[PDB]
Amino acid sequence: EPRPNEECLQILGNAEKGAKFLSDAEIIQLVNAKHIPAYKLETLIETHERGVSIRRQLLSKKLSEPSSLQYLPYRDYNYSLVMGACCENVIGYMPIPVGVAGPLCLDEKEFQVPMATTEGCLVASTNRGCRAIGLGGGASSRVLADGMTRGPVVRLPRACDSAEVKAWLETSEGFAVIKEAFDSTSRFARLQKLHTSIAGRNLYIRFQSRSGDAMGMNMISKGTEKALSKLHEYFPEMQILAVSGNYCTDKKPAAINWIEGRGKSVVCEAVIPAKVVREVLKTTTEAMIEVNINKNLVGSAMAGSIGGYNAHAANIVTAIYIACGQDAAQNVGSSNCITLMEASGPTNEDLYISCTMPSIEIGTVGGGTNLLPQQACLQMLGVQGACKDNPGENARQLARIVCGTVMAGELSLMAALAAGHLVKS
Amino acid sequence: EPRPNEECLQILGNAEKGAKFLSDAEIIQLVNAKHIPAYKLETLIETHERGVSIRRQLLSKKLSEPSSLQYLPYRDYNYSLVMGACCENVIGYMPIPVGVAGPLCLDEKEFQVPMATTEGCLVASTNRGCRAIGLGGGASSRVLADGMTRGPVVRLPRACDSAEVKAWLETSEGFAVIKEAFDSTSRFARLQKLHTSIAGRNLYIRFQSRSGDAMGMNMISKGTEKALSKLHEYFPEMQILAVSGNYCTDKKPAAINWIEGRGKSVVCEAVIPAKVVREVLKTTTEAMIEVNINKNLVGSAMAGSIGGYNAHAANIVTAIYIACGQDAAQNVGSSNCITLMEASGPTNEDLYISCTMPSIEIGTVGGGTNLLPQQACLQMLGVQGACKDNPGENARQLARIVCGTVMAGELSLMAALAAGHLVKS
Amino acid sequence: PRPNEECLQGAKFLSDAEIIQLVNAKHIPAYKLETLIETHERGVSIRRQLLSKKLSEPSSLQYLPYRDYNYSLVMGACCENVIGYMPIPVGVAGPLCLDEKEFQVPMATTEGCLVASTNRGCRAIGLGGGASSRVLADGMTRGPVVRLPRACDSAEVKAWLETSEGFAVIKEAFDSTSRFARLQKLHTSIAGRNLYIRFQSRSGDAMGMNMISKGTEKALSKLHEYFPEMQILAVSGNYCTDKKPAAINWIEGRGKSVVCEAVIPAKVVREVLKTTTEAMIEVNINKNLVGSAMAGSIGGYNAHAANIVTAIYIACGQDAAQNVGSSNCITLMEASGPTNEDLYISCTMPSIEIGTVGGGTNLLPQQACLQMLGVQGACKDNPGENARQLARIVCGTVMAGELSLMAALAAGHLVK
Amino acid sequence: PNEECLQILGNGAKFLSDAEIIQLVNAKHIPAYKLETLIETHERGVSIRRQLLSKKLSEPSSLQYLPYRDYNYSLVMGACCENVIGYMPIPVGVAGPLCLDEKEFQVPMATTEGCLVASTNRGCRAIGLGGGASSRVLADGMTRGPVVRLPRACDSAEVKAWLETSEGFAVIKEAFDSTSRFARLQKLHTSIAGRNLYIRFQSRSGDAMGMNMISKGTEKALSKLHEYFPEMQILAVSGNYCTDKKPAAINWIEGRGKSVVCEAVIPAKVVREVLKTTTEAMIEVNINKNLVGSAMAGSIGGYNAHAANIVTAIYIACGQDAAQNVGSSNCITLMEASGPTNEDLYISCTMPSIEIGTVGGGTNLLPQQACLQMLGVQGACKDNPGENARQLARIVCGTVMAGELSLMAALAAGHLVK
Numbered sequence A, B: 001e002p003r004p005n006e007e008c009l010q011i012l013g014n015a016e017k018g019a020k021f022l023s024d025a026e027i028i029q030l031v032n033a034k035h036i037p038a039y040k041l042e043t044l045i046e047t048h049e050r051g052v053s054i055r056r057q058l059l060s061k062k063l064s065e066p067s068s069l070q071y072l073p074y075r076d077y078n079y080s081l082v083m084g085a086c087c088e089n090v091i092g093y094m095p096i097p098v099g100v101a102g103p104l105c106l107d108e109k110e111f112q113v114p115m116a117t118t119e120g121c122l123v124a125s126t127n128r129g130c131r132a133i134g135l136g137g138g139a140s141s142r143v144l145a146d147g148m149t150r151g152p153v154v155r156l157p158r159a160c161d162s163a164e165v166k167a168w169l170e171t172s173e174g175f176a177v178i179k180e181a182f183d184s185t186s187r188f189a190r191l192q193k194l195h196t197s198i199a200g201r202n203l204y205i206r207f208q209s210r211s212g213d214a215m216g217m218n219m220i221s222k223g224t225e226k227a228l229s230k231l232h233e234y235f236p237e238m239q240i241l242a243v244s245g246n247y248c249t250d251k252k253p254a255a256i257n258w259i260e261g262r263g264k265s266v267v268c269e270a271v272i273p274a275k276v277v278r279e280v281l282k283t284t285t286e287a288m289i290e291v292n293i294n295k296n297l298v299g300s301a302m303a304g305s306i307g308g309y310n311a312h313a314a315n316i317v318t319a320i321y322i323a324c325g326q327d328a329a330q331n332v333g334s335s336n337c338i339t340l341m342e343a344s345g346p347t348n349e350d351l352y353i354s355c356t357m358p359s360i361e362i363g364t365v366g367g368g369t370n371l372l373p374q375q376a377c378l379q380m381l382g383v384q385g386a387c388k389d390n391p392g393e394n395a396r397q398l399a400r401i402v403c404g405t406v407m408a409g410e411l412s413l414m415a416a417l418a419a420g421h422l423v424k425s
Numbered sequence C: 001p002r003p004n005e006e007c008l009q010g011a012k013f014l015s016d017a018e019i020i021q022l023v024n025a026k027h028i029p030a031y032k033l034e035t036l037i038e039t040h041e042r043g044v045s046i047r048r049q050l051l052s053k054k055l056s057e058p059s060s061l062q063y064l065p066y067r068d069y070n071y072s073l074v075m076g077a078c079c080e081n082v083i084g085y086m087p088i089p090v091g092v093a094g095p096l097c098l099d100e101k102e103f104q105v106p107m108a109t110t111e112g113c114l115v116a117s118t119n120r121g122c123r124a125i126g127l128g129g130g131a132s133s134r135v136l137a138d139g140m141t142r143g144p145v146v147r148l149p150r151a152c153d154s155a156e157v158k159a160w161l162e163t164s165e166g167f168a169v170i171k172e173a174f175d176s177t178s179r180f181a182r183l184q185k186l187h188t189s190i191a192g193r194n195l196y197i198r199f200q201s202r203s204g205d206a207m208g209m210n211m212i213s214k215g216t217e218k219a220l221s222k223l224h225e226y227f228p229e230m231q232i233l234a235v236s237g238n239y240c241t242d243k244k245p246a247a248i249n250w251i252e253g254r255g256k257s258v259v260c261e262a263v264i265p266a267k268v269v270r271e272v273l274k275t276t277t278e279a280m281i282e283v284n285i286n287k288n289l290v291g292s293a294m295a296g297s298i299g300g301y302n303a304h305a306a307n308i309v310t311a312i313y314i315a316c317g318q319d320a321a322q323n324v325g326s327s328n329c330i331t332l333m334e335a336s337g338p339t340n341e342d343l344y345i346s347c348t349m350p351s352i353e354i355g356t357v358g359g360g361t362n363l364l365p366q367q368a369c370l371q372m373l374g375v376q377g378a379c380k381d382n383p384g385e386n387a388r389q390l391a392r393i394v395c396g397t398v399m400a401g402e403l404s405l406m407a408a409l410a411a412g413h414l415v416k
Numbered sequence D: 001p002n003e004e005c006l007q008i009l010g011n012g013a014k015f016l017s018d019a020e021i022i023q024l025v026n027a028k029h030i031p032a033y034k035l036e037t038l039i040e041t042h043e044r045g046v047s048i049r050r051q052l053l054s055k056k057l058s059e060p061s062s063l064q065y066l067p068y069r070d071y072n073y074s075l076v077m078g079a080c081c082e083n084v085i086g087y088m089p090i091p092v093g094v095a096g097p098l099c100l101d102e103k104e105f106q107v108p109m110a111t112t113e114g115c116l117v118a119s120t121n122r123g124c125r126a127i128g129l130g131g132g133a134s135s136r137v138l139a140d141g142m143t144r145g146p147v148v149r150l151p152r153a154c155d156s157a158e159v160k161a162w163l164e165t166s167e168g169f170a171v172i173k174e175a176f177d178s179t180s181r182f183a184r185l186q187k188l189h190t191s192i193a194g195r196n197l198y199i200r201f202q203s204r205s206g207d208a209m210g211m212n213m214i215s216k217g218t219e220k221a222l223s224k225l226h227e228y229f230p231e232m233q234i235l236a237v238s239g240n241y242c243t244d245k246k247p248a249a250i251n252w253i254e255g256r257g258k259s260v261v262c263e264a265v266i267p268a269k270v271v272r273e274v275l276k277t278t279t280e281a282m283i284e285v286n287i288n289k290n291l292v293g294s295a296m297a298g299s300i301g302g303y304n305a306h307a308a309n310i311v312t313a314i315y316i317a318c319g320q321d322a323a324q325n326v327g328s329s330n331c332i333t334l335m336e337a338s339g340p341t342n343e344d345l346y347i348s349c350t351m352p353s354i355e356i357g358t359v360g361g362g363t364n365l366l367p368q369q370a371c372l373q374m375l376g377v378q379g380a381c382k383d384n385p386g387e388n389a390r391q392l393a394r395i396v397c398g399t400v401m402a403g404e405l406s407l408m409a410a411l412a413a414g415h416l417v418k
């Protein structure tokens, strides 16, 4: 039934037939022995699933084991929201187990926190830390700052010239002009204080702005493009080298994120009664403080850590992020956390605990949050999509939930380490 | 039909009946009137899918939106390998779109590389970087080191005693004693030179060893347990404060991983002819090196980066990790990368590129790699499971692939920044 | 010698053995003698002789000099328990062509080749038409740590400081304590119920440490009136950061942030520096950026800025302990000119902590070195321009030092 | 007369006055660089240089108060300094006794910062009344960290693996060790960054700081490496991997020079009467300043109050390289409760990269030697090579801790200005 190549190509270019009529082996035969290239399988074929299936068959014959894809599932998944948006050369999907850790008592509310992980004991441990938090009157958090950044590098012909652009940007008149250009690109675009830094005839300019409920990379980058266009009108010798000169900084470790913040800067806290630490966490307060100082402060310091003065906030950040359609690679900066434990109340037997996380890069609109399964997890928290009355509130709430769930996860791993657990039981 | 609470209880305490003979609403009426806790749902119910179903039903009526879970899938998924191994309190699974970039021409072989992401353009950009490497003759990698670590903190009564223990561990006979205890806990356990650091009466002890094709955390922790128990026979006043004093360092940014290594230290390289840089990357070598020097080195320096001297290593690392059953939270350390670009060839128009990644924390057995869909992705690369013939070969191969694919994504992203793109197109 | 009863009854009429024997049988306490003796130089001699009696080598103080020094400006100012002085050889590297001027730079060092090397660096810069420089920013900082009952309370204080009216009353309290106290933008960080506050201000030509400490004093007291439950834990919570390696000094700057640059003709790199522009760029990329990167350095992207900074600081009465942060520097080298064969060099030092008044700039030997550079004392027609000028000179002299050593390294020097 | 004075230059220089030599330079019969030799004495060669310099300054009376007479320039010329125009007096104060390891020390400190010696001295008083401090040198080994390039990263991987084999390190150790009597190479640490290779040589240097000695050994060791790997370019003797006089985490973790630890318990009475505070307030300030504060500031290795003050003061006093306080001041200061009722103050400073020596450099000069002799660590130690330098490093750590106790007590007592 697989027709000759010259004939199949005619039915393809037929506007009232298309690949809908061609068989699987015929679409394959045209990719092989080049005619339809390979990447162009996306736009031609009838349904999205049949494109995934064809691409899987092509892929199977190139592999050293033909049936590698047998347990990689692809059927019945909604690919309409994925193609052209979230992923390319799609051959299926990867199911990541999702557990629940809660209720999380935070700001006089309750939250059932979804967490997608394959590390056993992670969700149970976090769930225990939530119960301890809940039995001690609950947690409270504050968003200290909010604004996604982009950190382009431009080049003037000399360091003195880039010193002049730095001085001009620092004047209130220069900032008003660059803020007009930036703010015109979108209704959420509101440029805050510019931070600049020189390295010879390079000039790194840190544009920061809130992005409503989106994480905001696409919004700040568009705002930055036009802003540097307006700056170029005043300084035509300027050469834009890159929209990112790693000064944002995005998806790399960097002290500037730790010190200036990026996206949402958050602080959570709680006071656990001496009873709850004993019963739920199987330790004392004196022991928790001892482990936290010498592990999370002194230990991190001996390791040469910048922004890693914590136990495992990266476990909780990553688990929520995958569950809620966040950019999981932004875990690199979003895990930044200092966990602090001290005595509280009369005997100095109650455990004070606070996690401060300067650079939670998060958003409840765009990216993976347009997909329905990760919209479901966002809906658990009540933060799905945009907030009309109070733009930004949903992404800020989710940032607060991340910091609170980190603190829950911190209480439980630190408690296990304090009561002598060396291995995953 | 829904029977009273006491009738349902004695059916649940019956052996040749049990939970199979109750309806969902009856089990839920038992949980509401506090006869069965939430965590007891795992061991009472017959099937795992029915346990996930009933946990979802309770969860839904605690939420502000009772239909929020509608689009979080849960059915027809193999929870036999998840319950009590990878996740707890399971309410479903989050599907991450999976894409393929390849062939990745690495060490005279070809790799179809799975990439689970929700960020648009990442799989297509990475795939273009692969094309540039393929038409450039290919890439070559070496594994420079190998050994997962654990960095426990112990406490001596005084600093003079911690110094005594440090000197003892540095003697070849004291080290032999501890290497015997450590190696006895597993067939892969081979303890390497002990790196130690004192902070007052604290002593941080960095145990390092290979772990076959396992990532190594369970195996190193077990070897660390017995090793410290032997050290205590020689120094009984020693206090084992925590199995991790953040010296390892695991899932936090730390300079020690950058300088000493953790897991696999790997380097990848390639020469991209000027012709390939022109037709695939749409830019010149000269423009590309200018961006790399001033973004990936200088820019990263101004930012105060330790080990983040790259464009988006974290994008590629994270995507391969989710797809292949790795711990995504370990992208914090595993993303460590310095990207170098120089001029090669006749008139300095070719592009020598290399990515050095000293701390890739990876494996092909254990964790999420026991799950069949994550195994499907590992089979794409011919690195699933353990190697009987040559232990470590699979995990070393996946680490070489993570490095070469990072370099593919570096080429492509850096080309796009060089060519004047400031926004995703 | 006379007995010990005739001496208690002034101090000028007694001998050195007499006052010593009063403390050696416990007649008089030792914290009395500071004021008792008339001449300052005999206070030093006695303190030495008392100290000789405790050392296993009595005569080890023999070649530690002490005579013919002006101790009047030091005592109750720069040093205590003074037993003499330490001579540090001063050399001169110049002339240095910087912003249409020439500078003979004094360098107090005991390291061989350092002054000759820096001096060759100046020769290369001179023959390439000199160096240019700009002060990018200027503000000494101080970073107290305060605590409030909860993290929610300290968040409230942070928000309060970020409004214009909160910053206005804090600026009112800060500016009141001194002439030069003009408070710039505040920077804050929270860690739980901790709150770190970075007060930045110019301070005339002084380095400013004590001035900002006074400004921070009244400013925290004002914040205490707004927030009565605020414990003031310390005036320095290491957030300044003063005399320790910190990323915040590198990123925000501290004291003077300065940039400096030069082009060295291809001919000059060949004949004076004995290398090639290409090779210089190769060593700079791979040593000062890639190498420092591998070593895990924050702000140490240079060859030996600290050699030059420390030498000038000791000679010019600066606080040499501040070389920790002042040495922060990134040396960049690029190709330049029509044939791409000329060597563009630039050093960027974001945190040079410096001044030309107060501290050890009060001493006459140190003021001699400051006068060489034409920057001594307070600039009367532009308060703070002498301190700016010395910072600029440090950056240009640091760049000269980089040129020479990197040229040496590139020509295969494993010496000295 | 111009032409008359040239004829006398051959017979000498001492039969020409200062004004006659200077006229010979200003109308160029002789260049500027011919003063090191022709002028017969060191003090008078400095004098003519100052006169030549004085005319080029906008204020020609600039150098009147820079001293130069009656100083030993012979140990300075061609070893410690060049283009010498005088010396710079730094006041030396004294802080002691410092009770360290069953001994007493009077510690010299060259500083122009008010209250530093007086405060360092109060910290000694608290330590003395607490029953003395203790200390241990945990490591010793100056490093050099050169950079080399091979054609490929694969080739540099081949060299790293070779340098890790028992036999590769044996051939290298032997070449390094032959150049000096103290040259004894410990295990190598290598990091690759592409086709670059950063090799960290480490060896003790007797009582010398070791920069010259390990440079010699590194040079020789790389020439043996070049014989096994001819395509290897030697880029630079330092690829900043040592790392010398720059902030770098490799010194914090691996150490460089003397890694040292120090400790002491300070009784409750002593904290209240000498230091005017409590153990509980000191602990609170130390946690939140030296740990949390430094963490918030992005500190690598600077977990202390003012270690750099003490290190700089002693270094300049004792003829050390004061530039090297960049890394030698790396310190973590820890305070916790101690004793039966948690009222005594355990304190410890750990300083992993103290770069120190008692022979060579500024320790060849006599005033600097006087300060070393006070401590009893001057010059080489014939019986136990290295022991004078280890003792000075222990003194630096103990004195720093005295300095931490004092300043931290002042901050805890509520003093905001000095």
Ligand SMILES: CCc1c(C(=O)Nc2ccc(-c3ccccc3)cc2)c2c(n1CC[C@@H](O)C[C@@H](O)CC(=O)O)CCCCC2
Pocket (backbone or CB within 6 Å): A119, A120, A121, A122, A124, A125, A128, A311, A312, A315, A412, A413, A416, A417, A421, A422, A423, A424, A425, B243, B244, B245, B246, B248, B249, B250, B251
């Ligand atoms: C977070 C998971 C976890 C745990 C851990 O949390 N265990 C735990 C605690 C409590 C319960 C529990 C549940 C319900 C009722 C009662 C009790 C169950 C399990 C433990 C370890 N890990 C892995 C840490 C890993 O992902 C990062 C670390 O490596 C980071 C670091 O600290 O360095 C490692 C071994 C040490 C302690 C136990």
Ligand SMILES: CCc1c(C(=O)Nc2ccc(-c3ccccc3)cc2)c2c(n1CC[C@@H](O)C[C@@H](O)CC(=O)O)CCCCC2
Pocket (backbone or CB within 6 Å): A243, A244, A246, A248, A249, A250, A251, B119, B120, B121, B122, B124, B125, B126, B128, B311, B312, B315, B412, B413, B416, B417, B421, B422, B423, B424, B425
């Ligand atoms: C990697 C995705 C990506 C790309 C990008 O790679 N775009 C791209 C390039 C090539 C093709 C292509 C495909 C087939 C044939 C021919 C060409 C398609 C798309 C671009 C950007 N980003 C986001 C990076 C983001 O996750 C981390 C950065 O923020 C990290 C950083 O550099 O700071 C950011 C905007 C500027 C550049 C383009």
Ligand SMILES: CCc1c(C(=O)Nc2ccc(-c3ccccc3)cc2)c2c(n1CC[C@@H](O)C[C@@H](O)CC(=O)O)CCCCC2
Pocket (backbone or CB within 6 Å): C111, C112, C113, C114, C116, C117, C120, C303, C304, C307, C404, C405, C408, C409, C413, C414, C415, C416, D215, D237, D238, D239, D240, D242, D243, D244, D245
């Ligand atoms: C800075 C002094 C110095 C020099 C050095 O600068 N030598 C030099 C250069 C030029 C002339 C000269 C003068 C007039 C006419 C012609 C030529 C004379 C001597 C050299 C080295 N050092 C010690 C660096 C030391 O304090 C920091 C380093 O350890 C820092 C680092 O690079 O990592 C160390 C060995 C390498 C090469 C030469």
Ligand SMILES: CCc1c(C(=O)Nc2ccc(-c3ccccc3)cc2)c2c(n1CC[C@@H](O)C[C@@H](O)CC(=O)O)CCCCC2
Pocket (backbone or CB within 6 Å): C213, C235, C236, C237, C238, C240, C241, C242, C243, D114, D115, D116, D118, D119, D122, D305, D306, D309, D406, D407, D410, D411, D415, D416, D417, D418
């Ligand atoms: C180090 C000197 C010093 C002191 C200080 O120590 N003062 C002091 C203490 C005790 C006595 C004394 C003497 C004999 C008997 C009884 C008591 C006298 C004076 C003080 C300050 N500084 C300057 C610190 C400066 O160089 C680094 C810091 O800026 C580094 C930092 O902490 O961030 C600064 C203001 C705060 C406290 C007082």
